[model samples]
Target: SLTDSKVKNAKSLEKEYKLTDGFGMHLLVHPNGSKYWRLSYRFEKKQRLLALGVYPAVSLADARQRRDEAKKLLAAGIDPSAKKQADNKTIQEKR
Candidate 1:
């Protein structure tokens, strides 16, 4: 069984998926059976996106690990949002 959310397009999906603190994350399952991982937090005086990784591929334990790691990084005053992009860039550059 699956729940349906009326976000038929990417734009609509973005509008519907939101984050809340303490709750940690939200699991969005698409009509096509695609799952999205999202985090909501305010860092550097603005809200940011922390991609925990795609669901199913990213196990529950793995996702929690990521959230914990990101939280730790934030405690050290690092913005997980920008850091993730930068880390991606570095990884790509190595290839």
Candidate 2:
């Protein structure tokens, strides 16, 4: 089980690594000292990775919520990655 304390204590390493929280969700620690929340899953026979966002700012709870939302989208036969891109496009179009 991953706790807020555990995630807070995750240190940078010589190489990038992941601290998994199951359900395809994980925290990726980079050598440059950046931590990112990621969700890994297979959709339509293809692997996909969704970047939730940076840790601390995103928070553990927020990350899990994002993961759940992604799962829901996957269950609905929607590709989360494509949806993300579409969302970005929409945001850009509004600007």
Candidate 3:
């Protein structure tokens, strides 16, 4: 349950830090002042990290929506990272 203000107000430190929402979804703040949305999960006995997108551009609601979609894919035994690659390929091909 993250609010827009909390995300907007997150500060950067000397290292990276994460502000978690739930279900392994969290916002990572880099020391360089870059913010990224990430999801940490385990798939097929291996732990994986998926980059959802950047903050402000992605928005809190959009990040949560993407996380939920990834969760569904995980439940269906599909790797979200692989799906993201396929999706990127599709977008690239359309260009």
Candidate 4:
């Protein structure tokens, strides 16, 4: 799990996260010090990944909450990824 990554320190992880909200994903810090957040899941025998945000901002609690929320969304058959974009488009058309 990304929660146990080596780059847990705020300063070191900042290079990857750049102060952005990790949105609740796993930050994979490679052995070479490279870091990336990967939201891993499975869909019909296919694995998927979602980039939440970055480190520090995307703390453990934040990532857990995101994972739980994603699970709930899946249970409800709602795609959290596309809903927001669709919502924004609708709102923008009215303005």
Candidate 5:
């Protein structure tokens, strides 16, 4: 399991690296010290990466919740990435 201290101490390296959490969730560490949260999962027979927010702001707990939400969406037969894009792309809907 990835920890807050490890994430906080994830210093910049020569290249980008990943800090795996579990269940398709991980933290991507950049050389510039920009840490981005990511979720790796398969949808429609292909693997895709879902971008969660940043570190500290999106903290470990928050990211874990996000991960759970995405998994639930998957269980409900919705493509998480597509759904995310649809939400971002639409301002109003038929609802």
Candidate 6:
């Protein structure tokens, strides 16, 4: 378990590890001093990880919003990861 204040000061170590924030939300601390936000959920009996951008950019509150939305989709029988990939790929090809 982790608090917002504790999340802000999470230091990197030689091996990466996660800081759990309940509801399957966690932050991954990398060995190179970077933080990544991720959410864990299961779909069709397979566990998956959905990225929520990086820390400071995603922020604590923002990440929670994303988690909420993902949960909503799951409740509606939709896969958030697949939906996100579809939408993102369409927008990422502008170049």
TM-score winner among the candidates? 3
lDDT string, candidate 4, 1-95, tens digits: 33434447533433344323344355665444545545666655467665543444455545555566666676787655543322222222345
The residue pairs that clash in candidate 2, if any, are none
TM-score for candidate 5, please give it. 0.84
Best by lDDT: 3
My TM-score estimates for the predictions, one after another, are: 0.60, 0.84, 0.85, 0.51, 0.84, 0.82
Whole-model lDDT, model 5: 0.80
Off by over 4 Å in 2: 84-95
Ranking by TM-score: 3, 5, 2, 6, 1, 4
Better of 1 and 6 by lDDT: 6
Candidate 6 lDDT by residue in tens digits, 1-95 = 67678889989999999999889989999999889988999998799998876777666766777778788889999988865522322212333
Error of 6 at 66 (Å): 0.6
**What is candidate 1's TM-score against the reference?**
0.60
Q: What is the C-alpha lDDT of each candidate?
A: 0.55, 0.80, 0.83, 0.49, 0.80, 0.79
lDDT value for candidate 2? Answer: 0.80
State the lDDT of candidate 1 residue by residue for 1-71, as single tens digits.
11122222333243344333244665555555566666666787787767776645554445555667777
Off by over 4 Å in 5: 83-95
By lDDT, the candidates rank as: 3, 2, 5, 6, 1, 4
Scored against the true structure, residue 86 in model 3 reaches a CA lDDT of 26
TM accuracy, model 3: 0.85
What pairs collide in candidate 3?
none
